[PDB]
């Protein structure tokens with residue numbers, strides 16, 4: 001199905017998975033299976049400086065969830081995170097819109113912005129201002 005994104009997570013550079021991992025640590029802090037559920041996610045969404053609803057919190061979860069159980073694993077995270085910044089996840093219809101870089105800024109900081117994606121160095125990089 002989403003082989004593009006599914007495989008994309010693997011195409012990423014060492015710096016990508018490395019930085020992304022540093023965030024997942026805190027993102028899935030306390031989770032049952034180190035995943036990102038409505039609770040683990042809702043805690044981050046608000047940490048950025050917002051306050052979403054519980055009904056919507058589940059939406060985004062399953063929206064990216066591969067199993068559709070209500071959680072997001074490592075790969076599943078990169079699958080949506082890889083397109084997050086690209087703005088090619090699903091669309092920008094409703095006002096709601098979560099950014100990848102923004103989130104990282106909370107988990108870690110600016111480290112996951114300029115010195116995040118190493119692909120820009122030599123590897124190909126599309127939709128990357």
Ligand SMILES: Cc1cc2c(cc1F)OC[C@@H](NS(=O)(=O)c1cc(C(=O)N3CC(C)(C#N)C3)c(C)[nH]1)C2
Pocket residue numbers: 036041045050052053056057059060061062063064071072080084089090095096097098099
């Ligand atoms: C499990 C997981 C999934 C998603 C995550 C991060 C994750 F941890 O981030 C991206 C998200 N895709 S999305 O369409 O941007 C998106 C954002 C939101 C949302 O609840 N809000 C935007 C907000 C912060 C405001 N204002 C409230 C919704 C419902 N979809 C899907």
